């Protein structure tokens, strides 16, 4: 199994550039609007403490250069919507794509489109930490670079990058500016909580295990949710909701192993080890594919 | 932070089609007026068990290839064979087609791999030549005719298409000429690969990654020559490491500090005792599908 992101070009032709004095990142153009980080207009200094209604009360639709390559948009209005600042531009962009935007839960992974200067640079896939921080590769002038998932030519905005926190993984916004955890916007010292293990992705890897012929770690057994989740809790697993239970559907019904079997398969794992044994040629259990991932990366959709 | 990151797919995108020889569907690449694809397109399910391509091909029409781009049909309106690749001359120019090149890459180099289904891209992820000439893909019924690329300001070097899936579950095409990497062949018959090794300059670029990203539980004290270190690589079926490759690796030994044959003696002692459960970028394995190149353009 690999990780493997969604086809970029969609968002690809939506990346511009945004730059207040001499501080440039990247915005996402949709219509006639453009969302960017709304420190932006921060100097260097004003980083550390910032006031950001106050810094944006002395800034006008003049003072936004916006590019799409060398090519600048005129701004003709502004507002803050959280931590994003929205543009308002007088370019309608031709590639715009069908689009929604999502807030989504730990666990759940997206493609990101990693940019610098409004030109888009690489792209892979992340995973949602449960204490909201993502494992992403990014480096000075990234911000603005979005995360995002496609269903059927409709492409769900779900990150936008803001930060790097000092463990070295990254926190960010929805596109409505919201951080994702308990982060601000202030370059300030923060720290990520601890983090634990994706219970339903781990789910999800034994699964695609199954699929593939590997099913040494199927037992006899079974277990209730909340016996499973308190006993997953000991082992810095995340408890599983009624949502973790019903994306795992498909692939109960494909493998014919219900939910509750696995769980309690799992459960054994964790108070027994795996003996020197691999899963999917891995001794380690993978966190990082959700139920859709096994089951996109199965099929041939597109 | 440092993760397996592909190129940005847009441009190879807009360049993919579907092409379809009676009730054998696949994908092809649309450059210009003409259209780029795997030749047992025009072998039926049976024919592929033992195909005579150029005795297929010479009782071929051009109506015999529907192209799809999209909705829209193209009008084949001329065909050809090289290698093991079918060039179809269509009737329409496509305008999406970026810069590009036709590149033959060496065993250990990277590339993306855009997989299609049916004309559509279906995901995009990273590969290496493993040199053993096969690729670790992910790769399904109808992907064929799916490309591999890297991208040099917006200049696109195509250097795969996709064809066959071995019985291990790795994966066997051609460059964009037709010709296979690797001793195989396009008929539908169980094929082996020589014994694959790793890629030594790829683990040790790795391992400066690992450096770079504040990480250094593996080094050590001591200190080899470069024929002492291809000893141990090879009785470990490591590729041998050349002084090309030491010099490759300059950059990197330079941003860290440790001379390239430094990082060699700490992959030794990781090859002669192993990680000791310990992981490295949170892998329990030696990871090699990394170029120097590609740890510095994303490390810096
Ligand atoms: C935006 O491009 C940038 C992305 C950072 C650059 C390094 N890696 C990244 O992901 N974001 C910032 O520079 C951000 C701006 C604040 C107003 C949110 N600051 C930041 O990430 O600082 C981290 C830091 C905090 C405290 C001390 C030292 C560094
Ligand atoms: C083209 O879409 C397809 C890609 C394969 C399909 C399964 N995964 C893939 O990557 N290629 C073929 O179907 C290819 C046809 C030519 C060799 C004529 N055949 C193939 O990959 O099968 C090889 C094989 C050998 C022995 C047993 C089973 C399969």
């Not at 308002?88 to 069908?98: E, I, S």
């Not at 277990?223 to 909701?241: H, R, S």
């Not at 999917?280 to 991932?293: I, K, N, Q, R």
């Amino acid at each position: 199994f690999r990780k493997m992101a969604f086809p970029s070009g969609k968002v690809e032709g939506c990346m511009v550039q945004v730059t207040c004095g001499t501080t440039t990142l990247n915005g996402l153009w949709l219509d006639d609007v453009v969302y960017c980080p709304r420190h932006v207009i921060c100097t260097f200094e004003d980083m550390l403490n910032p006031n950001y209604e106050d810094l944006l009360i002395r800034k006008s639709n003049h003072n936004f250069l916006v590019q799409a390559g060398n090519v600048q948009l005129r701004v003709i209005g502004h507002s803050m919507q959280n931590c994003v600042l929205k543009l308002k531009v007088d370019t309608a962009n031709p590639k715009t794509p069908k689009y929604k935007f999502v807030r989504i839960q730990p666990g759940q992974t997206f493609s990101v489109l990693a940019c610098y200067n409004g030109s888009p640079s690489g792209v892979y896939q992340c995973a949602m930490r449960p204490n909201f921080t993502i494992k992403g590769s990014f480096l000075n002038g990234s911000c603005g670079s979005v995360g995002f998932n496609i269903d059927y030519d409709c492409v769900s905005f779900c990150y936008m990058h803001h930060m790097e926190l000092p463990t070295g993984v990254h926190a960010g916004t929805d596109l409505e500016g919201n951080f994702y955890g308990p982060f601000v916007d202030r370059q300030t010292a923060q720290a990520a909580g601890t983090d634990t293990t994706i219970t339903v992705n781990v789910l999800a890897w034994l699964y695609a295990a199954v699929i593939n012929g590997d099913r040494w770690f199927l037992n006899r057994f079974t277990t209730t949710l909340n016996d499973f989740n308190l006993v997953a809790m000991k082992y810095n697993y995340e408890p599983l909701t009624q949502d973790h239970v019903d994306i795992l559907g498909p692939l109960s019904a494909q493998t014919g192993i219900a939910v509750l079997d696995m769980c309690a398969s799992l459960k054994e794992l964790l108070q027994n080890g795996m003996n020197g044994r691999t899963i999917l040629g891995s001794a380690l259990l993978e966190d990082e594919f959700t139920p859709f991932d096994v089951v996109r990366q199965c099929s041939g959709v597109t």
